[PDB]
Amino acid sequence: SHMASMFYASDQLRHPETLVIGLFQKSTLSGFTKELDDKLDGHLTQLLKDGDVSAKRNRVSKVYPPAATGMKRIYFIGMGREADYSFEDTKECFARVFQQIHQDKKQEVSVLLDTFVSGEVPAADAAHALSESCLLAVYEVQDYKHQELTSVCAVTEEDLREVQAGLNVGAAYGQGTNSARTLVNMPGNMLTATDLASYAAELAAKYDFECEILEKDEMEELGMGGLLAVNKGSSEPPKMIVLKYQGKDQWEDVIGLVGKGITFDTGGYSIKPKTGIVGMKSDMGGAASVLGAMEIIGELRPEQNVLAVIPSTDNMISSDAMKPDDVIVSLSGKTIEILNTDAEGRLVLADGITYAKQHGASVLVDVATLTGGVIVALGNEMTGAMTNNAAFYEQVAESAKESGEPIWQLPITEKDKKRVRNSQMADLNNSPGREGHAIMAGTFLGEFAENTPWVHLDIAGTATANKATCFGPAGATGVMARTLAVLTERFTPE
Ligand code: NI
Ligand SMILES: [Zn+2]
Ligand SMILES: [Zn+2]
User: Fold this and answer.
1) Chain centroid offset of residue 219 CA
2) How far is the CA of 314 from the centre of ligand 2 (A)?
3) Distance CA 490, CA 252 (A)
4) What is the distance in A from the centroid of ligand 1 to the CA of 122?
5) 3-class secondary structure for 148-209?
6) Catalytic positions, please?
């Protein structure tokens, strides 16, 4: 059927109307750029000389050549010094330049990929940078208010099957990210647990994954007390969304990914302040992460098994909502005292984690926008991590190093498990205080993890951003979707 892709590798500059060219801080031109300079009677040299065009990293200069040439626009993007130039410099160079092209409302673009390759960054890599960074930079918030770029040609003298391969993975990663951004940016009345369950089903159909969606009654029968406690105040029914992707002949070494899917967090009876409750549609950020990553896995079909489990519900006030001091029986059969109804996320994750384990997960990663504390500990741009297994954590850390999404581990100590076990009435205390706030939530989850190698990721700070950047709009960031995807590529068992 020969379907056209947005990103296309060619050896020819068929579409020279709109160009994108990287410039190093060499002090001579070469390759295409030199030919262009000559083709332009030395104008590009003059512009560099006068500083109208700059090779300083992330400077973007737009030149409009004479119509005589076949070119209307050139977007020059500075790359700094070639000795310092790395892959993630490439990502940022593409992001900066497509920010500008997205503003300019251009439809077709020819990138001279080779102007971006170097010792450190080969063609296939530059290609990955381009599609991923392009997709992230040009993303638009799906709004409900009362132009699109649809062709990017990567023009290169290198193996087209390889370059195209880079463009394809780049594009998969960006697509899953943007998917997650979408789910996250959606107003809570537009995305209930029910809507989240349709999305998952559509995804399951599209990529032929096994999908099961447990409803309240099956949850009652199975004893899912965590997820049912949070849902008690809701009229919107709950969902436990399960997705199976078996990409190995044997259902074994299964990677369990658990996402917090709280579709709106009011904080419940332990009520949240007037400023704190705005933006709490984004409390399903963790679910976005895993769904985003399923999309990526569905596109790249790696040789790995993955169980995705997403407990999903809103957290509301009513005549029947959970109350502070309630004691509950989790799925695992552990009892939990609810000291704080705003610590609802770890209740649902606890059931999610025990379910994943019950369904053959042999390693776990949970992703949750879980605590304000993580923001205090690490800021808005560094996701917090906790683990019960250094070896598995190394795999997750390395994934994040490849992803480019920064992670930092916080300790779980014996003293920490002491605090979480400190409840007068139950096995576990859902909220011991602000002291090591993020670690308390990690520590609680790890009790449900028991012996299964596990990593918890708190994306309360990294799941959203106040301001636009080169890599996308204000609002949801789709953080972690990449890192989970990469983890499933790179994961090898014990
Ligand atoms: Ni063409
Ligand atoms: Zn909460
Ligand atoms: Zn929450």
Assistant:
1) 29
2) 10
3) 16
4) 24
5) CCCEEEEECCCCHHHHHHHHHHHHHHHHHHHHHHHHHHCCHHHCCHHHHHHHHHHHHHHHCC
6) 272, 346
